Amino acid sequence: MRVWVGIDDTDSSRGMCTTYLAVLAMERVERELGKVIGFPRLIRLNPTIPRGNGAVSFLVEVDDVGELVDVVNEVIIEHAMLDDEKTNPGAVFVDEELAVKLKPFADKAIKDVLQIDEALFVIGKYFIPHLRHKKGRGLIGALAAVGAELEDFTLELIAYRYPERFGTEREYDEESFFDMDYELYPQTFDNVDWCNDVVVCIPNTPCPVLYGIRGESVEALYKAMESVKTEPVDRRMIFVTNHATDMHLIGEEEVHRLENYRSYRLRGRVTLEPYDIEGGHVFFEIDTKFGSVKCAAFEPTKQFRNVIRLLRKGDVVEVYGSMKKDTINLEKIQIVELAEIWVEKNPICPSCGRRMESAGRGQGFRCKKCRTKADEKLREKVERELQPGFYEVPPSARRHLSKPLIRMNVEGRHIFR
Ligand SMILES: [Mg+2]
Numbered sequence: 545m546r547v548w549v550g551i552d553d554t555d556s557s558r559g560m561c562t563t564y565l566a567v568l569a570m571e572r573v574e575r576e577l578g579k580v581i582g583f584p585r586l587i588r589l590n591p592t593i594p595r596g597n598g599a600v601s602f603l604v605e606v607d608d609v610g611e612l613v614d615v616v617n618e619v620i621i622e623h624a625m626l627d628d629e630k631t632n633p634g635a636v637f638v639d640e641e642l643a644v645k646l647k648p649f650a651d652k653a654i655k656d657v658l659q660i661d662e663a664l665f666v667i668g669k670y671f672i673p674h675l676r677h678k679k680g681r682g683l684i685g686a687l688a689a690v691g692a693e694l695e696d697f698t699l700e701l702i703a704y705r706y707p708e709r710f711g712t713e714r715e716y717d718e719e720s721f722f723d724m725d726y727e728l729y730p731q732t733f734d735n736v737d738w739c740n741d742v743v744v745c746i747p748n749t750p751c752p753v754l755y756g757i758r759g760e761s762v763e764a765l766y767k768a769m770e771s772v773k774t775e776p777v778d779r780r781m782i783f784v785t786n787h788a789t790d791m792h793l794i795g796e797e798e799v800h801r802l803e804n805y806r807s808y809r810l811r812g813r814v815t816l817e818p819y820d821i822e823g824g825h826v827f828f829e830i831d832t833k834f835g836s837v838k839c840a841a842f843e844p845t846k847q848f849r850n851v852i853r854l855l856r857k858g859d860v861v862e863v864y865g866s867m868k869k870d871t872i873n874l875e876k877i878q879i880v881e882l883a884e885i886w887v888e889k890n891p892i893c894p895s896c897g898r899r900m901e902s903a904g905r906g907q908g909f910r911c912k913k914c915r916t917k918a919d920e921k922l923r924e925k926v927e928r929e930l931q932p933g934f935y936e937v938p939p940s941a942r943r944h945l946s947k948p949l950i951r952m953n954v955e956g957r958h959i960f961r
Pocket residue numbers: 552553555562596597598599685
């Protein structure tokens with residue numbers, strides 16, 4: 545029997561994660577019960593809920609479901625850090641035929657906020673077998689990993705370390721990764737920030753992941769793997785993911801009001817012009833269908849603040865990001881229509897080229913150093929530095945679910961390698 549297995553909430557801010565444990569589980573199943581069918585899936589959920597918010601599923605074929613539960617159960621007891629207060633493992637076991645009924649659930653988990661009671665209701669309703677070793681908060685993610693429909697998807701090859709070296713500093717050749725990026729980009733993407741000289745695919749944490757490489761094909765991913773120079777790789781796995789799909793984005797048309805803890809694409813026109821602040825942050829405001837909305841480019845977006853700092857009143861713009869504390873964290877932005885600015889100003893002297901000074905209330909204008917004259921004010925359309933089109937935050941600040949420009953089929957994209 546083909547059964548989908550879902551798991552979340554295994555993470556300890558010290559030595560275990562989500563994906564690692566799912567690989568172990570996969571190994572055990574493969575050896576005790578049956579075969580894992582296809583690739584496992586890594587499903588990131590609402591990225592606003594109080595880094596790295598992702599559940600995992602995989603398809604297996606086994607003879608008996610009750611044994612499957614037990615196998616996974618034991619994997620959890622042995623490997624998950626159950627003592628850690630922020631670790632409430634959940635897992636579910638769903639007939640292939642029944643996964644489809646969970647698409648809406650998954651959707652809501654990715655875009656919205658969910659309660660445990662809902663997860664439980666669904667489980668009771670379909671007599672879904674499940675594990676909840678502590679709190680059942682992890683059953684939300686487990687159910688979502690199983691239900692999620694992936695129209696668009698990307699792949700990530702995740703390489704894990706040898707246990708012996710968990711918690712220690714990683715060893716790797718930096719150039720290795722920049723070189724790998726030159727070769728394969730964009731079949732691999734967002735693994736390096738050229739502008740900021742950062743290897744993005746290598747985490748900063750006491751976790752089992754050595755590196756994770758995002759990309760479009762299995763071919764490219766394994767190519768990336770062979771070119772890269774690191775300390776030895778123990779386990780390795782490719783997941784189909786909802787990374788880089790903007791799957792979390794609720795469009796303005798979809799909704800009456802805006803809420804915090806949700807993410808949006810919405811168009812507006814600038815009202816309150818941009819202004820820096822206290823910590824290296826650049827705010828502004830736009831008028832929208834929902835009224836006045838605060839947008840923000842925080843310090844960690846670096847050069848992306850430069851393009852934001854430009855725009856002026858009335859500019860038509862479309863914004864992408866999460867709402868926290870009633871302001872939108874910009875991930876991406878489109879300059880749609882540039883505001884036309886007219887200006888009436890003093891005439892430029894034709895000889896010396898400097899600005900003509902007034903000559904009195906009705907007396908027109910003059911340039912005294914030449915012997916020159918003119919009667920009416922020069923009238924120019926203001927020419928601004930900001931081109932229309934699309935702009936995004938640099939890779940070192942890309943959020944997991946943020947669809948990067950390179951993966952969009954649009955005109956006027958401004959990408960800075
Ligand atoms: Mg998680």
